[PDB]
Design a protein around this ligand. Structure first.
Ligand code: A1AJA
Ligand code: A1AJA
Ligand code: CA
Ligand code: CA
Ligand code: CA
Ligand code: CA
Ligand code: CA
Ligand code: CA
Ligand code: CA
Ligand code: CA
Lengths: 633, 633
């Protein structure tokens, strides 16, 4: 950075010189009228060149060479080390008239060199390097650089009703581990020369996105209602350590990028602005919320149910015991239908984070008309789609209107997840279902011993085929819902189901809804028919023309690596086994998937299309780092 | 695009097949219970493959081969030509039980193939090609593709008080030349089969950004308050021609990209949504506003002044006569200080466009608390800055606060121009000046016979040097403002100017303001001191501590290739010439620039820091096409 510093007619000019800049210096303007030539002297730590018409010549400390005064003959002044208390950094210019060789006048430039650098961890290795050249930009990918900030959305103090970033306070030293370090490194004399100060500042727009903290306590200096802070200079070689927290995830109208600036200001006069003679900038990107697909290793299984749902608890406990997961119980289905589990990550730092569509908030566990909802989401395993790799998978958003226009719509979740960028979301149509959730009709499971995964789809046509076979085999009087005494009076048999013509038509329409979704999934996830297994399902149309489950949706399962917790369907009994259970085992068991049917409904004596329990699984994060992605521009 | 179309248990399914898709067809679900094998027949224009476990075999029209019924044995159905009135496109599946070789049941798929394509000029050559593969995206650069839309901001009808895009009407055929063509191309039978319709739609967000128009008149079908339109199918090979207009320039919160969609819908039942069985999308980018630098050829010079400013008119007329420009006169300085001239361009189409900070609006001439203003702008010639090329130059925005934070600020012009992208704007500090305009302290001029350009900067230090020389030479009693009788009583001489110590200090501060700007210009435009010429200027500090011109700012000139219209400074007369005029000629004339001093102030008898005339120049556009740029992401 070349900076203009002119000498002043017959006078001395004092200036601070910031390392990594250099000066071009007018000597012509300060020359007395009549002067024809100049000479110069300079101290040892100042490099001076005479520059005529772009041609530079280095000049000695203590010569007596003279040059013609000309508008286009200037000086270039460079320093590489900071001034100390013992420094006499100066350039002095003598001016001569035609006749004599004694100087008629002198003009001086007295310099104090300082180093000033606002440093962040732009190379993403967890330590704050010195003046990364790329610290003022943010680039994606393995060769990308740019510092990363977490949203401080967990809670260090159960005293507080809110998450940590909701205030302008830091109570615990532990909190600083969620924050990113930013260091203002300076080198120079004991004091700044008279008339200078150093300020740190942010934009008003960024003031609800960041907080900056500096006895030995925690002072809030920038953020909500604080855009400008005067810094106290320490002389010699000094480091001022700041902690930065993110307050806000990327969203519609917020890219995730925030900036912090330092400037060295020069006082001119009262009533006149200070002159910003040097500025340095750092950029942070706020880490996105990332959802965890079913192929990632399970750590904890969270379950909600009523206290006397004993079979459910027993069978879930049992399922989880076949794994190394822990079970957490809360005493209908909010843990699944209100809430999604994901995580955030920065270099050597990260924690699980819950998104709520209006608890678990503590240390290292954070919290956060629409046609979509945070409780109506699924996420694929990593996929490659027509050459493009999606290493964190893609999110599926269940929507009442997954099209691009034709009506007024608010899609708050689509907007939020699109802003996260890294799981490039895809909308699906879920509002043909009474309950309205994508997890009632699709799931993903690993193929054990691979590598690969399957999409599981609910299928009415698979159910009809199965029931028609059983009827043909002589089992038409097989009874459904055995052991649900509240259903017994309906005496629902295969024959009764298959005779109901209206039900056939309803389920043909629902199969159209499933297949429309299937086609989007195959295109947007890069799947073939070889990647899909259809599980038998059956619905009844409600008065709003939506699909109510006729029996429990088996696709809405708990996936714990090779172990599957599948809702018990209470299907027609053939040879004293559920034909639906036997059918599903026949589909999944050959792949090495282990099926456990979990009875969530017996405690209620009947099934009316709703289940009254929920589950969610906290999983280990991807090993792939989000910042190594290159998202679409 | 693979699409799911299942056969229906023992029944016939009728479907529309859209060219560029293909079907995968379940035959297993439609099989009667007990059936073990199937065969198939198909018509000549349908390709059918049997696919087992991902392995496809092409099947004859009229064989008798049988395959085991299996969930994982399906059909793949492909067509490449549209159906006509004579077409019998069908696949029929026969099912057999173990024993007999007579079919026990049949299921049929009856197909109508159509072509449907929403086409735009994505290859940017001005003709609408057939189904450009890239039409649903927009990419920058010489190898970029994506259709371009102009803001229809000119006026075809002087009857109308507003510009054309301000309504949902098109009055003149001439208007359609400002619009982009979009063609819905179809091929198929006389009618769509029963239960289908074609719709065009946009988002609510895009409804104030676009209008779409289809007797032989102009019907508004999409745009403000119109998000959805049912299209009337014409059979055979048909083209439906639409005209699209842009309503809005890119801005804060609008990228410039808009989408239009077509879908083929299938009717299912009353009270149930239609199924979108096919969708096609096109993208437009709205062309940015581009400002014209002083190196571009002048076409028209617009001047405002009072009717009796005869010398001004005479001297401007004279200046323009040395060129081939036309002169347009309007009877203080709104043509310069309220208004900026630029242009918009699409393939084989474009016109000049004026931006107003609250007339010329007619055919092929369009119209459009803040710390910035559209009347406070300059633009560089094309520059290369640290390797990055800026082929349309960069805009300089004069600001009262050109820093990135520390206070609440609205910067409407910065936001708007940033959104245009292609002239990557740079903020300068202009509010140290009473009038507050960047054109009072900087200009750009071509070096004739090149190639190259110079930055011209106002300089107080150049003025002081000149006056001190003249005083030394014995001309201290030289009088300023000769011929301005309203100034005569002040008897302002060089000696009087140079004796005023307060004035020296004021102008030293103003030189600091100039140099701060100089340093930004050099860094952001890639300039050295070799590219800059300093013109003498002098200010007096007003009561708000701002700089009022002491004599006319010569830098604020009319640039007509090699001819410069420079404000007459009314400087001290030495040997009966203005020493300021002689000095400026000495700087510029050696470069082949021709200087004409234009007296704008004599008619007022005095100078108090304001000039009461304005000029603006409409120039030819860059030959470089904006869409060949690659802007920073
Ligand atoms: C006024 N408020 C405050 O200073 C702080 C304190 C509480 C919170 N405030 C934030 C606050 C609020 C409003 C501000 N406006 C400016 C400003 C104005 C014009 C230009 C300008 O940039 C340039 C100036 C020169 C050149 Cl060549 C190019 C650019 C900045 N600043 C300045 C600071 C400042 O000059 N203060 C000030 C002090 C005295 N008085 S004095 C000289 O005696 O100190 C009298 C007048 C003023 C305006 C600023 C901001 C961010 C980063 C660097 C700066 Br240099 C504001 C700061
Ligand atoms: C209702 N308003 C209107 O149609 C038009 C007319 C004036 C302006 N309106 C715009 C308007 C307003 C609201 C709309 N809501 C939808 C909609 C709803 C649910 C899903 C859905 O997408 C899918 C449906 C199925 C699958 Cl698998 C996957 C996705 C779309 N659409 C549909 C059209 C539609 O289905 N209309 C309709 C007609 C009857 N009645 S009927 C069947 O007798 O025609 C009864 C109910 C409805 C909802 C739409 C929009 C854009 C592009 C394609 C479509 Br397919 C609306 C259109
Ligand atoms: Ca580091
Ligand atoms: Ca906090
Ligand atoms: Ca915390
Ligand atoms: Ca923490
Ligand atoms: Ca074309
Ligand atoms: Ca119009
Ligand atoms: Ca028009
Ligand atoms: Ca026009």
């Amino acid at each position: 950075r070349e900076r203009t510093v002119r000498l002043q007619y017959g006078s001395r000019v004092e200036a601070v010189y910031v390392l990594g800049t250099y000066l071009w210096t007018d000597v012509y303007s300060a020359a007395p009228a009549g002067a024809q030539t100049f000479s110069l002297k300079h101290s040892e730590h100042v490099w001076v060149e005479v520059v005529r018409d772009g041609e530079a010549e280095e000049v000695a400390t203590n010569g007596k060479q003279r040059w013609l005064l000309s508008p286009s003959t200037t000086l270039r002044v460079t320093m590489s080390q900071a001034s100390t208390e013992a420094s006499s950094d100066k350039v002095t210019v003598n001016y001569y008239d035609e006749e004599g060789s004694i100087p008629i006048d002198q003009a001086g430039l007295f310099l104090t060199a300082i180093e000033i650098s606002l440093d962040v961890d732009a190379d993403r290795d967890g330590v704050v390097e010195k003046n990364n050249p790329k610290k003022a930009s943010w680039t994606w990918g393995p060769e990308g650089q740019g510092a990363i900030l977490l949203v401080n959305c967990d809670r260090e103090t159960p005293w507080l009703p809110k998450e940590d970033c909701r205030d302008e306070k830091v109570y615990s030293k532990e909190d600083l581990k969620d924050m990113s370090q930013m260091i203002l490194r300076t080198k120079g004399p004991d004091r700044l020369p008279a008339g200078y100060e150093i300020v740190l500042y942010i934009s008003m727009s960024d003031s609800d996105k960041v907080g900056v903290f500096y006895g030995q306590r925690y002072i809030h200096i920038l953020g909500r209602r604080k855009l400008y802070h005067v810094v106290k200079y320490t002389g010699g070689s000094a480091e001022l350590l700041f902690f930065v927290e993110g307050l806000c995830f990327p969203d519609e109208g917020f890219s995730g990028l925030v900036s912090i600036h330092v400037s060295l200001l020069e006082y001119m006069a009262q009533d006149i602005p200070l002159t910003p003679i040097f500025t340095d900038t750092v950029i942070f990107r706020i880490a996105p919320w990332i959802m965890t697909p079913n192929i990632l290793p399970p750590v904890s299984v969270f379950v909600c149910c009523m206290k006397d749902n004993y079979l459910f608890l027993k069978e879930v406990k049992n399922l989880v015991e076949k794994t190394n997961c822990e079970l957490k119980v809360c005493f209908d289905r909010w843990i699944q239908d209100e809430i999604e589990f994901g995580y955030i990550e920065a270099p050597h730092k990260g924690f699980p984070v819950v998104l709520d569509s209006p608890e678990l908030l503590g240390p290292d566990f954070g919290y956060v008309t629409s046609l979509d909802s945070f409780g109506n989401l699924e996420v694929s395993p990593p996929v490659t789609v027509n050459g493009k790799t999606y290493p964190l998978g893609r999110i599926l958003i269940g929507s009442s209107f997954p099209l691009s226009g034709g009506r007024r719509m608010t899609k708050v979740v689509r907007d939020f997840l699109k802003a996260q960028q890294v799981q490039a979301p895809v909308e699906l149509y879920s509002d043909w279902l009474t309950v309205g959730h994508v997890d009632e009709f699709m799931s993903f499971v690993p193929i054990p011993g691979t590598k690969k995964f399957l999409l599981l789809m609910a299928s009415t046509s698979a159910c009809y085929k199965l029931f028609r076979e059983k009827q043909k085999d002589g089992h038409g009087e097989a009874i459904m819902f055995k052991g649900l005494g509240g259903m017994s009076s309906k005496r629902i048999t295969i024959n009764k189901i298959l005779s109901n013509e209206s039900l056939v038509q309803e389920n043909l329409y629902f199969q159209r809804c499933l297949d429309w979704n299937r086609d989007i999934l195959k295109k947007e996830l890069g799947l073939t028919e070889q990647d899909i297994i259809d599980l038998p399902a059956l619905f009844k149309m409600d008065e709003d023309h939506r699909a109510r489950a006729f029996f429990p949706n088996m696709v809405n399962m708990i996936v714990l690596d090779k172990d599957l917790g599948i809702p018990k369907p209470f299907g027609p009994q053939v040879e004293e086994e559920c034909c639906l259970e036997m059918h599903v085992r026949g589909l999944l068991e050959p792949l090495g998937l282990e099926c456990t049917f979990i009875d969530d409904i017996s405690a209620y004596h009947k099934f009316l299309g709703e289940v009254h329990c929920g589950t969610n699984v906290r999983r280990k994060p991807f090993t792939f780092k989000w910042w190594h992605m290159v998202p679409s521009r």
